[PDB]
């Protein structure tokens, strides 16, 4: 039994801390409006979604991204209070954060014990998946740029070790044209556009099949493709005949 007037939320049957439907609220003592966003209460930082519900998690304030923690995580903190959390990673569900000396979450590129990570500027959450950053293509897992062949919006790119091609940054997709790539014990072939080819291919008189999901040549034994079984050698070359 509450009402929302002109994007401002009020509850009747009210000011201060209110538990409603299990979810926690703080209606401003003066305006009776439900607090939204970063909110200071008794010198203690809290954070509410746009709907007024208090949150546990990592959210941006005027001093950067803060950790709004469950009860009794640090000192005797109240549920939802921002806490001191220094020089370490935080793992919340499948999200990863790195917290600095001033208990704020890292954003952008950061070097942690000699390893480089990228944390999304808008969430502080460890990057995952294809990303374009200052016109450079990266493919992230758990905040770490991956090396290998991964599928982006324009097909499979070669995300390479530093200085593979004219000083590319570590994990940056590079130009890599009309040639085989032998990488993870895996075999790939790259066309003129620097994308890995998939499917059946004839290259230098030999037949190959590059798996659609990974772009790796079928290699090292028996494979089923199109409902039948083929043998592919150690070099990815299809043997004669079909079983």
């Amino acid at each position: 039994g509450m009402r929302t007037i002109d994007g401002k939320k009020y509850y009747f049957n009210a000011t201060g801390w209110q538990t409603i439907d299990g979810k926690k609220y703080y209606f401003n003592t003066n305006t009776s409006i439900a607090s939204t966003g970063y909110t200071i209460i008794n010198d203690k930082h809290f954070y509410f979604n746009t709907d007024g519900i208090m949150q546990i998690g990592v959210f941006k304030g005027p001093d950067g991204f803060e950790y709004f923690a469950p009860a009794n995580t640090d000192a005797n903190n109240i549920e939802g209070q921002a806490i001191r959390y220094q020089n370490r990673f935080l793992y919340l569900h499948d999200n990863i954060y790195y917290f600095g000396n001033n208990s704020k979450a890292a954003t952008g590129w950061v070097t942690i014990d000699g390893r480089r990570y990228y944390f999304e500027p808008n969430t502080a959450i460890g990057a995952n998946g294809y990303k374009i950053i200052d016109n450079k293509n990266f493919y992230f897992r758990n905040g770490l740029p991956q090396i290998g062949v991964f599928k982006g919006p324009n097909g499979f790119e070669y995300f390479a070790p530093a200085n593979t091609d004219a000083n590319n940054i570590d994990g940056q997709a590079i130009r890599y044209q009309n040639r085989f790539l032998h990488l993870l014990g895996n075999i790939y072939y790259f066309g003129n556009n620097s994308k890995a080819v998939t499917g059946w291919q004839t290259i230098n008189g030999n037949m190959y099949y590059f798996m659609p999901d990974t772009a790796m040549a079928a290699a090292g034994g028996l494979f089923e493709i199109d409902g039948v079984i083929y043998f592919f050698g150690v070099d990815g070359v299809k043997a004669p005949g079909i079983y």
Epitope: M211, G220, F223, E224, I225, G227, I229
Partner: nanobody, 123 residues
Framework: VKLEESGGGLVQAGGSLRLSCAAS????????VAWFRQAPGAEREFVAV????????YYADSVKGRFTISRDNAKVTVYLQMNNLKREDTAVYFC?????????????????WGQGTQVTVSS
């Protein structure tokens, strides 16, 4: 995919058995299906594989000519006909699906397995 093997048991050398591997879902028919066998103490050794369609097969050398792998996708079932059985054929037999369709002889590449059925060849 859930798989259930049946048809094993005790048998005299030179005899025969037909093993069955039944699934519960039609999606079975999308994937190649293999038999592996495990003797006590030993590792799961490859026996035969059949393609999703049933038109393409491959057998280990030791069973070639004696065993025949087949399937009936209407009954969502794969069969292994085992003729002229030998003492060396004694083992638990498992059927397995390889949904990635890669490296069909390698048991590690198979993600769905039956519970197994015992085959024991006497004298």
């Amino acid at each position: 995919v859930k798989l259930e093997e049946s048809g094993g048991g005790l048998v005299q050398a030179g005899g025969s058995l037909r093993l069955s591997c039944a699934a519960s879902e039609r999606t079975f028919s999308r994937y190649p299906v293999a038999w592996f066998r495990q003797a006590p103490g030993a590792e799961r050794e490859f026996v035969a594989v059949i393609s999703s369609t049933g038109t393409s097969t491959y057998y280990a050398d030791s069973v070639k000519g004696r065993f025949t792998i087949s399937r009936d996708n209407a009954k969502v079932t794969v069969y292994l006909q085992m003729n002229n059985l030998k003492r060396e054929d004694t083992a638990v037999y498992f059927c397995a699906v390889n949904s990635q369709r890669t490296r069909l002889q390698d048991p590690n590449e198979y993600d769905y397995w039956g519970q197994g059925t015992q085959v024991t060849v006497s004298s």
